[model samples]
Target: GHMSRNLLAIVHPILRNLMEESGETVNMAVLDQSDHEAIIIDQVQCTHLMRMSAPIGGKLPMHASGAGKAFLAQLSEEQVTKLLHRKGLHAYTHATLVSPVHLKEDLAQTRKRGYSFDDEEHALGLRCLAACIFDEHREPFAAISISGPISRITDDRVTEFGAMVIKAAKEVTLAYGGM
Candidate 1:
């Protein structure tokens, strides 16, 4: 609760600026690890043009959504197992990764890159990139994502947006009192 509202306050302006500058859509989701997933607690939907929509309280598996994967990347292998052991992984599309080995690799990549991607894996035509904002305890509390039609988010843009999201996440971490 402490992280959601204030973090939303901190990210709303950054998301607006990112969307405006990049001419793309962005989203935000608060991590609810208690339930083995992250839920969309807030979102700044710029996807109207792309016929895309997201709502508050929508649930996504930790291995699927960009926000979920970003948060997952913050956890250790044992911690990830505890979080995902019950629910397991589910495939929303053929592109979605269901294998634990591959999922682990993705999380590792996210840890290395400081961001995660949903490469049309959650939904057929959508692609997203997310980065986590940590709490004062250095725990990831939430994540911010920029998404749109796969056609719009090319490989080059992924690198660009990835950096932007990482920077924004760090700014949010400081704003949220994280070291």
Candidate 2:
């Protein structure tokens, strides 16, 4: 139930670099499949006076969080549907996608873009960008994300942050000897 120490060591620096570059809180999380949520395993908080922070071990809804959606985007449509069915999508905010149809559409976009976005969907005034980290079997086992206040992480900067998060996730996967 724990990540290898070696992997954790490599992940922290990458997360720190990401936090520095994005000037936002950077997080690494793994899916808690049994709980149907994403659990933060590592985090690097930005040195901003007013910053968003997601504590290590915090749980995020799979249906409404950027890191969670990044993991879901790696799954087949049927798998995603089956998994989500067991935990009905609960609305966290007005922007949260509560319908399966809408969520699927968003996932499709996430797959196409190589990253997932949470535009204040999980919490009002918060925005996040994330990408999946693959394991040796080429399966998604974790995700890396950058989170901040919507006022700072504006729509114009989403794609920029998305690209950075994707790169960071890739670095962690490669460092861990994953595909």
Candidate 3:
């Protein structure tokens, strides 16, 4: 799937520099849509957190990805419901969210908290925190996610990472002139 290289480059250095300067050693995933998949347009691997990071153009399920849920949480409930109906919810792991009721609950929490959690929903032993990045029209166009192993991402750490990732998304929104 072809993504906008120009758009990807704009946030690449900013997110990379932000992560590096923070000294958190957490991988950053910059994701956008590619038809139905949430594609990883860019990623910066963590030095100590992830064994291997998803490469550029990695595809994640819309129902099972942190970045996907973050972006979805920003959409209207009707929009999200239609997407789920069109895509059909599927489980990827033990923690994968398959029930629409539970998934919507999670989305509600994400919308309220300004971030979404993976909690090994996409893959076992991995966790991610993601926040949406809006366009100038206040449309959710992309998302930024920080991911690592569960061992390094406890509940308290999730709170901290949630703050950091949401702040990062806000900075990106400012730079993008999003409301």
lDDT of 1 by residue, 105-160 (tens): 98998888878998988899888889987776667777877877877778788898
Q: If ranked by lDDT, best first, what sequence of candidates would result?
A: 2, 1, 3
Off by over 4 Å in 3: 1-4, 21-34, 49-52
Point out the worst 10-residue segment of candidate 2 by lDDT: 1-10
Clashing pairs in 3: none
- Model 1 regions lying over 4 Å from their true place: 4-7
Model 1 sits at a Cα RMSD from the real structure of 2.3
Q: Tens-digit lDDT track for model 3 on 1-179?
A: 12256656666766786566433433334444445457676677667734437766777777777887886676677877887887778888988889888888898888888789888888998788888776666767677778777777777777888888888878777776622
lDDT of 1 at 1: 31
Please report, in order, the local distance difference test score of every candidate based on alpha carbons: 0.76, 0.85, 0.72
Per-residue accuracy of model 2 over 1-179 as CA lDDT, tens digit each: 33665788867889999998999999889877666678898888998888878777898888799998887777687888887777668899999998889999999999999999999999999999999887766877788899999889988999999999988988888887841
Best by TM-score: 2
**lDDT: which candidate is best?**
2
Provide the global lDDT of candidate 2 against the true structure: 0.85
